Design an enzyme around this catalytic site. Structure first.
Site, mmCIF file in Angstrom:
data_model
loop_
_atom_site.group_PDB
_atom_site.id
_atom_site.type_symbol
_atom_site.label_atom_id
_atom_site.label_comp_id
_atom_site.label_asym_id
_atom_site.label_seq_id
_atom_site.Cartn_x
_atom_site.Cartn_y
_atom_site.Cartn_z
ATOM 1 N N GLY C 10 26.660 79.757 -16.161
ATOM 2 C CA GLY C 10 25.499 79.716 -15.303
ATOM 3 C C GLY C 10 24.623 80.941 -15.460
ATOM 4 O O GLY C 10 24.974 81.929 -16.104
ATOM 5 N N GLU C 245 50.698 91.781 -12.859
ATOM 6 C CA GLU C 245 51.337 92.169 -11.609
ATOM 7 C C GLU C 245 50.500 91.791 -10.389
ATOM 8 O O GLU C 245 51.065 91.431 -9.350
ATOM 9 C CB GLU C 245 51.629 93.670 -11.632
ATOM 10 C CG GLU C 245 52.644 94.055 -12.703
ATOM 11 C CD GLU C 245 52.915 95.546 -12.766
ATOM 12 O OE1 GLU C 245 52.235 96.307 -12.051
ATOM 13 O OE2 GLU C 245 53.807 95.959 -13.537
HETATM 14 N N1 LIG Z 1 25.468 87.950 -8.732
HETATM 15 C C1 LIG Z 1 24.200 87.545 -8.817
HETATM 16 N N2 LIG Z 1 23.850 86.364 -8.316
HETATM 17 C C2 LIG Z 1 22.542 86.099 -8.471
HETATM 18 C C3 LIG Z 1 21.582 86.884 -9.059
HETATM 19 N N3 LIG Z 1 20.348 86.256 -9.013
HETATM 20 C C4 LIG Z 1 20.588 85.117 -8.411
HETATM 21 N N4 LIG Z 1 21.899 84.960 -8.060
HETATM 22 C C5 LIG Z 1 22.514 83.805 -7.400
HETATM 23 O O1 LIG Z 1 22.467 82.710 -8.293
HETATM 24 C C6 LIG Z 1 22.175 81.519 -7.542
HETATM 25 C C7 LIG Z 1 21.604 80.470 -8.461
HETATM 26 O O2 LIG Z 1 22.503 80.262 -9.570
HETATM 27 P P1 LIG Z 1 22.022 80.249 -11.084
HETATM 28 O O3 LIG Z 1 23.153 80.802 -11.936
HETATM 29 O O4 LIG Z 1 20.803 81.058 -11.275
HETATM 30 O O5 LIG Z 1 21.747 78.756 -11.564
HETATM 31 P P2 LIG Z 1 22.472 77.833 -12.639
HETATM 32 O O6 LIG Z 1 23.973 77.823 -12.384
HETATM 33 O O7 LIG Z 1 22.181 78.295 -14.009
HETATM 34 O O8 LIG Z 1 21.912 76.359 -12.432
HETATM 35 P P3 LIG Z 1 20.395 75.901 -12.304
HETATM 36 O O9 LIG Z 1 20.175 75.223 -11.014
HETATM 37 O O10 LIG Z 1 20.124 75.012 -13.507
HETATM 38 O O11 LIG Z 1 19.586 77.184 -12.455
HETATM 39 C C8 LIG Z 1 21.232 82.003 -6.455
HETATM 40 O O12 LIG Z 1 21.269 81.127 -5.334
HETATM 41 C C9 LIG Z 1 21.800 83.384 -6.107
HETATM 42 O O13 LIG Z 1 22.735 83.307 -5.038
HETATM 43 C C10 LIG Z 1 21.976 88.142 -9.601
HETATM 44 O O14 LIG Z 1 21.266 88.951 -10.189
HETATM 45 N N5 LIG Z 1 23.319 88.391 -9.426
#
Ligand SMILES: Nc1nc2c(ncn2[C@@H]2O[C@H](COP(=O)(O)OP(=O)(O)OP(=O)(O)O)[C@@H](O)[C@H]2O)c(=O)[nH]1
Ligand SMILES: Nc1nc2c(ncn2[C@@H]2O[C@H](COP(=O)(O)CP(=O)(O)OP(=O)(O)O)[C@@H](O)[C@H]2O)c(=O)[nH]1
Ligand SMILES: Nc1nc2c(ncn2[C@@H]2O[C@H](COP(=O)(O)OP(=O)(O)OP(=O)(O)O)[C@@H](O)[C@H]2O)c(=O)[nH]1
Ligand SMILES: [Mg+2]
Ligand SMILES: [Mg+2]
Ligand SMILES: [Mg+2]
Lengths: 423, 429, 423
Positions: C10, C245
């Protein structure tokens, strides 16, 4: 002291030979003028002056592609008594290459063989780069091989050929070529070689990062194979496997002589890094179905015999562990009653580059190739069900039953691999 | 080697060759005089096939110009590329065929045929190796109907192995320029179905359409009507005159295509086609050159491939190009128009790639098609024949020349024998 | 000799990995070109030439964020056979990531694992940086973990995940992701890890003196956690605690595998002084509720197990007095029937800085996390009470009762922590 001459039949074989002898001159440092600023008698001979000539014979019934050598960059390399041209092509008609025109200039090409066979004394193999697509590369191929077993009989005759593709097929009567040529190359050739055009594309597309290949680049892949088969004669490795042994190793029964070539590793320039290319890493990529050059899935049958020709930098104990992995797997499986199914060959010479550390040529006489004939038998039935294009072969002097005589001949060929597959 | 002798006839076919040899002039750097001015040395390497290199830096068109009245020979020799020909080869009558097939085949056809058959013999003796003969004429006029068809039967008596192709214009579907166009078609159908190896068939109306639909022209002249066939004929042998990554010539096109010798009546196809300014706003590449061919409107014979079935497909490309860009395009389009083809041929697409473009655009393609769509035009033509035959009109001319009804009837039956055979493989699958 | 590969699923996991491998290269002195001017086999492998590549696989169904690595500053580090892209995203649809598109490129990513598993021999854990927010980071996550327990079964599989926030929630069907993904990650993952976005803000606002954080800075906090978990493998301390562990220490019952990460001390540059950061000072700040990265009050439940991973400069007797304080308090209290509730790990390596003396990672498998599921069950009921958005999952091939089958599955999950809480 040991020699291996080469013959090029048809238009597709000449463009193979244009890149092959391009590579051989870069191997031994030969210029296009036959000049170089030890033991290479296999592909060359020395003149009275310091010039070397190739042991090659170029035949064609049309004068087009030979003029591309007679006027090209590789012009001064070839003896003009070797460059043999016709006037009228077979023009995708097998009956013209076998009866009409090829019967006339057959005297000249066969006479050039014994003129080369004077200086040869360790005659150990023949090279016939012939395709099954064009009529000249197939019709002359049957007429040529009949006289040589009358000429020599005991000497080796090898055919680095081009298999007609099951999907990307250019001409129309390409199914008619294969059934007619079957009786010759099963009764004269010691070990024929199939290479499909179709598997080369994805190797060019994915593994070579160029989605749109050129026929100049298709020949570069096979030209690396032909060199590493000759890597024991032209040089010295710790385990040199000469060409007499391959036809004795890879052939359990004298009709089964159809292995397939597999060159590995096939990388691009930008992907030369992000890898290390150890001798256990690359041999698993050999048995990958998308790295071979024949459109046949190797996990649809069993292996009867396998050969591995290494070059570059190779330690056999490091290869000993690599071969021990492949016997200890399950998706890769052999013919069970042949438990000794490896032929290893090591040369301490690097794979040269044409404008890496090590390279592997894999030769696997397997039962996975037998489905390719059935894919081509399915093409040949329906075009003969209409009795289509009969008035060209009969229009050029051929029996109708000569199709039918060769029709059951593929069935006796096909039942061989089916019989060897079961225990 | 493998030189080609050119024969003309009629009045339409001469003006086509009056433009076609201008095409071959700049495809070989040939000046309007007869000398040489090209720079690419690939022209001189195979210059002999359409030109005798005469004495003293000369090049003459290996061509035989035939008419029956001195008007059109005067128009060629006075206009462009008339002094390039040999004055010995302007072999023409004095009467004019009168738009009668029987005048061109029986009475006045026997006069000038002896003057031609020595010139055919003088060129065929002078040629080192002979490839085949080509003919450009009409099927509507008198001189194009009788005089050209009288020659080819005498040539089949001479040469069994030499190929033969006629770029004969089909009589028009809807416009009626010729009053007796069935009587110049049906009596010419019988000669073409016997002893012509391949036969090119061009409708008049689609040539008006392609000059109007794609190009959007306002005042199309015959210098632009007949120019499309002139580029078409050049694309047939463009793999002969120059090397390629996959060469071709007139014998490779014959044996690949023609499945049975009575089914050899073909249709052309050319690409690309633009306007004068609407020429850059398009990705003129292989997939555009792919889909420009296979539509119904590109066929210079007005026929719908949807209302018919193909048998074989040839394709000749020009200019440098890759292969998987071509090959997958030359494979996938058989699957989208899957039911339109016929079952009993795997991979009916013949590909031919030269390595020399036209003098102009970077890449070009020439389509050579074969389908069952053409027989539906003949049922109109057989109707056009029988409409003028069920009253038995226009007979006293042919009776004055001397001909029974059976020669009209069996040729109409042999026209129906063409009907009974293109329908036969169409009904099969 | 010991290895631990990493997978990024993702869009949210990739931007985590962009800062993670930024940190790892700064650890071992690696350039962005895989170059450095001993024992680091866990996260790297050596080529034939002097270049090292990361053991990372980047999957995405949309081609956007992977091009940010394929064109970014960290471009030359990655093998282009690792960088795997799709065409059409799941686009916040779990049924698209689980049924529609992810079923097609599942063959490529799983094949890259065994290509990495050749050179690995001490395979000791997996890393899956997946969020529960996006559909691609959740829908591919369920399809990926099913094959690996079929592949390995005995090997360790860890998930440094991102918990969806109870208040600051971006997308709409984020409550639909968690209930559907529950059956996979409770039946495949050995120890999952929850991190909320919401607790990071006040740590950035108050403790880091920047009230308005960036997602580039949110990833810097978790990237320090992932390194210090691997601080025993990549280096040598007096008490090195390996990853075999932790799953044996922190798990009293094989369903309960949800601890939370806590990095400490979290200071600013100007607040680097006015402090001394002794080993007893900072561990009380670990159990402070406003320093953890999960929005759960630790004084609303009991601790089942606790872990402490020290680095920098640490003497264990000085930590022995620090742990003796925390057992001798009252507002901090354990599960009573687990009186041995500490796992200590010391490494003599300083916490590196990305553009102090010691650092603590706290891993506390507690019952305070069980209220976070109930805050998300309350979101999921009402959006399913209307039968809202059923025509997208059923619109992409999913059973209605598959929601209902997973509906009671959270109740069996929730009654676990309630049962362990009482004596
Ligand atoms: N840890 C982290 N989470 C993030 C960040 N930016 C966004 N997110 C989280 O990522 C979520 C969205 O997931 P994505 O990974 O961007 O989307 P995807 O899984 O690729 O799926 P799509 O819907 O196709 O974009 C948001 O609701 C945030 O909670 C970041 O910089 N770090
Ligand atoms: N596409 C073209 N069709 C033409 C042209 N000139 C005539 N035609 C057509 O050809 C037919 C007439 O044939 P010709 O021009 O060859 C007359 P020809 O010398 O053959 O015989 P006569 O009738 O004795 O003059 C008729 O169908 C006309 O519509 C032309 O330049 N282009
Ligand atoms: N290996 C290889 N095969 C090629 C190449 N180009 C074309 N071919 C194959 O060659 C086939 C045609 O055979 P040719 O050798 O060109 O023709 P020919 O043997 O001279 O026979 P005719 O020209 O028909 O008289 C095609 O259908 C392709 O399968 C090339 O560059 N390399
Ligand atoms: Mg050829
Ligand atoms: Mg006229
Ligand atoms: Mg995303």
């Amino acid at each position: 002291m040991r020699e291996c001459i080469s013959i090029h039949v048809g238009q597709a074989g000449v463009q193979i030979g244009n890149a092959c002898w391009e590579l051989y001159c870069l191997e031994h440092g030969i210029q296009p003028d036959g000049q170089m600023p030890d033991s290479f008698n296999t592909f060359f001979s020395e003149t009275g002056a310091g010039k070397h000539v190739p042991r090659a014979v170029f035949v064609d019934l049309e004068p087009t592609v030979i003029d591309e050598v007679r006027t090209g960059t590789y012009r001064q390399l070839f003896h003009p008594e070797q460059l043999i041209t016709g006037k009228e092509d077979a023009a995708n008609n097998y009956a013209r290459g076998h009866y009409t025109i090829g019967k006339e200039i057959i005297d000249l090409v066969l006479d050039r063989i014994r003129k080369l066979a004077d200086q040869c004394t360790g005659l150990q193999g023949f090279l016939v780069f012939h395709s099954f697509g064009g009529g000249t590369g197939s019709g002359f191929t049957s007429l040529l091989m009949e006289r040589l077993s009358v000429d020599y009989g005991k000497k080796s005759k090898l055919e680095f050929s081009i298999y007609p593709a099951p999907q990307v097929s250019t001409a129309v009567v390409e199914p008619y070529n294969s059934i007619l040529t079957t009786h010759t190359t099963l009764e004269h050739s010691d070990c024929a070689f199939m290479v499909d055009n179709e598997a080369i594309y994805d190797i060019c597309r994915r593994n070579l990062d160029i989605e749109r290949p050129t026929y100049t680049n298709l020949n570069r892949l096979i030209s690396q194979i032909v060199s590493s088969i000759t890597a024991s004669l032209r040089f010295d490795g710790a385990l040199n496997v000469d060409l007499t042994e391959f036809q004795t190793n890879l052939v359990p029964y004298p009709r089964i002589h159809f292995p397939l070539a597999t060159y590995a590793p096939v990388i691009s320039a930008e992907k030369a890094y992000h890898e290390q290319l150890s001798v256990a890493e690359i041999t698993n990529a050999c048995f990958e179905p998308a790295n071979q050059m024949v459109k046949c899935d190797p996990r649809h049958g069993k292996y009867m015999a396998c050969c591995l020709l290494y070059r570059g930098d190779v330690v056999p104990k490091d290869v000993n562990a690599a071969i021990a992995t492949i016997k200890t797997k399950r998706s890769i499986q052999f013919v069970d009653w042949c438990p000794t199914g490896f032929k290893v060959g090591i040369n301490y010479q690097p794979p040269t580059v044409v404008p890496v550390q090590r390279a592997v040529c894999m030769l696997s006489n397997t039962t996975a190739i037998a489905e390719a004939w059935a894919r081509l038998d399915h093409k040949f039935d329906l075009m003969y069900a209409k009795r289509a294009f009969v008035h060209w072969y009969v229009g050029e002097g051929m029996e109708e039953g000569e199709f039918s005589e060769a029709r059951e001949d593929m069935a006796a060929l096909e039942k061989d691999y089916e019989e060897v597959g079961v225990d | 080697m493998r030189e080609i002798v050119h024969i003309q006839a009629g009045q339409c076919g001469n003006q086509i060759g009056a433009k076609f040899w201008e095409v071959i002039s700049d495809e070989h750097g040939i000046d309007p005089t007869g000398s040489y001015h090209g720079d690419s040395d690939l022209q001189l390497e195979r210059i002999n096939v359409y030109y005798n290199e005469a004495a003293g830096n000369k090049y003459v068109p290996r061509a035989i110009l035939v008419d029956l009245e001195p008007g059109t020979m005067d128009s060629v020799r006075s206009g462009p590329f008339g002094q390039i020909f040999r004055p010995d080869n302007f072999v023409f009558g004095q009467s004019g065929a009168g738009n009668n097939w029987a005048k061109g085949h029986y009475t006045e056809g026997a006069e000038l045929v002896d003057s031609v058959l020595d010139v055919v013999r003088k060129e065929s003796e002078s040629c080192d190796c002979l490839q085949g003969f080509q003919l450009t004429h009409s099927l509507g006029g008198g001189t194009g109907s009788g005089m050209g068809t009288l020659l080819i039967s005498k040539i089949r008596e001479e040469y069994p192995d030499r190929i033969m192709n006629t770029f004969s214009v089909v009589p028009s579907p809807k416009v009626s320029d010729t009053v007796v166009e069935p009587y110049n078609a049906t009596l010419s159908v019988h000669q073409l179905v016997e002893n012509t190896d391949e036969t090119y068939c061009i409708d008049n109306e689609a040539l008006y359409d392609i000059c109007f639909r794609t190009l959007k022209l306002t005042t199309p002249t015959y210098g632009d009507l007949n120019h499309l066939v002139s580029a078409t004929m050049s694309g047939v042998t463009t793999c002969l005159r120059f090397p390629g990554q996959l060469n071709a010539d007139l014998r490779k096109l014959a044996v690949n295509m023609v499945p049975f010798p009575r089914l050899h009546f073909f249709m052309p196809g050319f690409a690309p086609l633009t306007s004068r300014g609407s020429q850059q706003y398009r990705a003129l590449t292989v997939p555009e050159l792919t889909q420009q061919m296979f539509d119904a409107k590109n066929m210079m014979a007005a026929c719908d491939p949807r209302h018919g079935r193909y048998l074989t497909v040839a394709a000749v490309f020009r200019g440098r190009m890759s292969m998987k860009e071509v090959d997958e395009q030359m494979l996938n389009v058989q699957n989208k128009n899957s039911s339109y083809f016929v079952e009993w041929i795997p991979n009916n697409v013949k590909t031919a790639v030269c390595d020399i473009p036209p003098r102009g655009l970077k890449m070009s393609a020439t389509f050579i098609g074969n389908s069952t769509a053409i027989q539906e035009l003949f049922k109109r033509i057989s109707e056009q024949f029988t409409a003028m035959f069920r009253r038995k009109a226009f007979l006293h001319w042919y009776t004055g020349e001397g001909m029974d009804e059976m020669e009209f009837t069996e040729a109409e039956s042999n026209m129906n024998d063409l009907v009974s055979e293109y329908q036969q493989y169409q009904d099969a699958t």
